[PDB]
């Protein structure tokens, strides 16, 4: 069940303080990764992941929450997911979020260290939900590695939004 990426890039970034995904919710710990279609070693572990909470719990009719970039998103709005793979990983606790620093690890909660756009190393988790018969294998966050580089990955809101109303 246990995954341990290679370089991804995080967005929608929540893993300092919770967040409500929608209204009433439950605050959560969370992040999307984007995983490049390069990185066959992560992709792969992924997978033999995923099969195997689906072992321990009709596979080709398996939900699952690892999504293709270039399928889901239109990659001229959101290049980011270009030639990608991506994943939305949760935790109800607080994960470890660290850096390196003179080659130790320490932790850090500075937002221009740990923020939507960074490069990170992830470990996170594959398990089989059942929520009101909606069923699946999902993975959970484990602990980020922030490696403090990348462009940030700003919100903009869309036009049915901007014109919605009027």
């Not at 370089?7 to 999307?32: D, I, T």
């Not at 490049?36 to 070693?41: H, L």
């Amino acid at each position: 069940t246990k995954v341990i990426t290679n370089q991804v890039r995080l967005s929608f970034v929540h893993v300092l303080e919770p967040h409500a995904m929608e209204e009433g919710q439950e605050k959560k710990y969370s992040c999307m990764l984007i995983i490049p279609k390069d990185d066959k070693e992560t992709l792969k572990a992924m997978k033999e992941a995923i099969k195997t909470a689906y072992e321990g719990a009709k596979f080709e009719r398996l939900k699952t929450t690892l999504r293709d970039g270039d399928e889901e998103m239109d990659t001229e709005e959101r290049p980011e997911f270009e030639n990608a793979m991506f994943i939305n990983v949760s935790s109800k606790t607080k994960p470890q979020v660290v850096k390196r620093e003179d080659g130790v690890l320490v932790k850090t909660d500075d937002p221009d260290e740990v923020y939507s756009g960074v490069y990170a190393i992830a470990s996170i988790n594959f398990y089989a939900y059942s929520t009101a018969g909606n069923k699946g294998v999902t993975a959970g966050l484990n602990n980020i590695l922030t490696l403090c580089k990348g462009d940030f990955l700003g919100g903009r809101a869309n036009a049915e939004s901007d014109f919605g109303d009027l």
